[PDB]
A paper describes a structure:
Challenging this view, we present V3-crown directed broadly neutralizing Designed Ankyrin Repeat Proteins (bnDs) matching the breadth of V3-base bnAbs.
Noteworthy, we observed that the Post-CCR5-V3 conformation is occasionally sampled spontaneously, possibly promoting the interaction with either CCR5 or bnD.2. Despite different preferences for the Inter- or Post-CCR5-V3 conformation, the bnDs overlapped in their contact patterns, engaging mainly with R/H308, I309, P313, F317, and Y318. The bnDs make extensive contacts with Y318 and F317 which are exposed to opposite sides of the V3 loop in the Inter- and Post-CCR5-V3 conformations, due to the presence or absence of the helical turn. MAb 10A37 targets a conformation closely related to Post-CCR5-V3 bound by bnD.245,46.
Numbering used by the authors:
A (entry chain B): 1 to 15
B (entry chain A): 11 to 139
Amino acid sequence: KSIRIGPGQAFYAXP
Amino acid sequence: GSDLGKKLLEAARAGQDDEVRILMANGADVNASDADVGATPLHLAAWAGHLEIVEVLLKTGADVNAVDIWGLTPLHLAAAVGHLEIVEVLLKHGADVNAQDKFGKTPFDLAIDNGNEDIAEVLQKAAKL
Ligand SMILES: [Ca+2]
């Protein structure tokens, strides 16, 4: 969750 | 034997490199895309830090510059998380250093924003060609 990726975090996180 | 593309997406995310090889031997589409967001196995392997899987997928024809619904490429994802060796392999296989996501951000921008200065330097040098 610490990775700054934007709205796509909803699919990839993960960190 | 059924739904090999969904299975390959899952195996790539999960780091199951033996299962990736099995699925591809049974015909799984290396360019399978998630039905809701368009991510490919290479996106997931690059984000999750699975170098062996990245290399298997590239060798079997994964599109290095595939985009998802947010405009993200595998290089964006590896640059954000900070996997230098994956960044280097993607660049060697033709990853587009100039690719912009839906917000205009390049892989360099994501490396900067995530404190991955060594990767940002690699990407800046590659953008000079
Ligand atoms: Ca750092």
